[PDB]
Amino acid sequence: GSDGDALLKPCKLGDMQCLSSATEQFLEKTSKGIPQYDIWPIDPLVVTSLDVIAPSDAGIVIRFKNLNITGLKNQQISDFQMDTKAKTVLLKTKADLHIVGDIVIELTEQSKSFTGLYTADTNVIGAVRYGYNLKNDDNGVQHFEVQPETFTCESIGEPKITLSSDLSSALEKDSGNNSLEPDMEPLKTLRQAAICKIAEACYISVVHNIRASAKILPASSFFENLN
Ligand SMILES: COC(=O)/C=C(\C)CC/C=C(\C)CC[C@H]1OC1(C)C
């Protein structure tokens, strides 16, 4: 990652150009993850495993493994709302996410299981709501209180699903589509629950990074003035 000449800087409130630029840059640096700042990587982002249930029949269970998600550290903030009167910050991010890893299709109703490769590429637009407060740490420095954020999926643009020739063929042949339909289920979840779930997993990493960082730097570090 050829990005180490910057990580975080003071921005003005209401400036979607400064704030957004900060989240993009900071995320870009932490994208590699560094144990020196208690920051985990998120680009590329590998998932040792990712289970997801399908409401289609409450029996289809898709368990992904070693999922490679790239194209997030360079995301773009779609919207953001900062309220001091309520100390709340709701901002949504959108960017082309590329997932590449394993996928296990365990049918509880059909009493079967499958394993293959899963490759998806599409834009993921999700909204996150988290509170923000200002309190002096145990040293006397006004730190930044990062409340528990909340994931809120919005859209996924054009979900481009791409399963291995063995898996994709095993599904289309198991359902009778012969072309594995996108909205035929469990495929429906492979583009909805899959994308959404993945986004959440990554959101936890990015959030944690900022949390630990706020412990090393004050609030002013993020905004030129928050009081
Ligand atoms: C999802 O993106 C962010 O949280 C980052 C933004 C809006 C730009 C940089 C500013 C912060 C991380 C400060 C937000 C506030 O939650 C604290 C306490 C970190």
CA 210, chain centre distance (Å): 14
CA 84, chain centre distance (Å): 26
Count CA within 13 A, CB hemisphere, residue 144.
23
Where along the chain do its domains lie?
Answer: 5-227
Asked if residue 93 lies in contact with residue 26, where contact means CB atoms within 8 angstroms, the answer is no
> In whole angstroms, what is the distance from residue 140 CA to residue 146 CA?
17
Task: Tell which residue, 69, 72, 183, has the closest CA to residue 120.
Answer: 69
> How far apart are the CA of 152 and the centre of ligand 1, in A?
16
> How far apart are the CA of 24 and the centre of ligand 1, in A?
10
Q: Which residues line ligand 1 (CB under 6 A)?
A: 19, 22-23, 89, 91, 128, 130, 132, 144, 146, 210, 214, 222
List % helix, strand, coil for the chain (3-state, nearest 5).
25, 40, 35
Cβ-based neighbour number of residue 187 at 10 Å: 25
Task: Tell which residue, 155, 174, 57, 178, has the closest CA to residue 113.
Answer: 174
- The DSSP secondary-structure symbol of 39 reads B
Pick the CATH number of 5-227 from 3.40.50.261, 3.40.190.10, 3.15.10.30, 3.40.50.1260: 3.15.10.30
Q: Whose CA is nearest to atom 14 of ligand 1?
A: 132
> In whole angstroms, what is the distance from residue 196 CA to residue 153 CA?
6
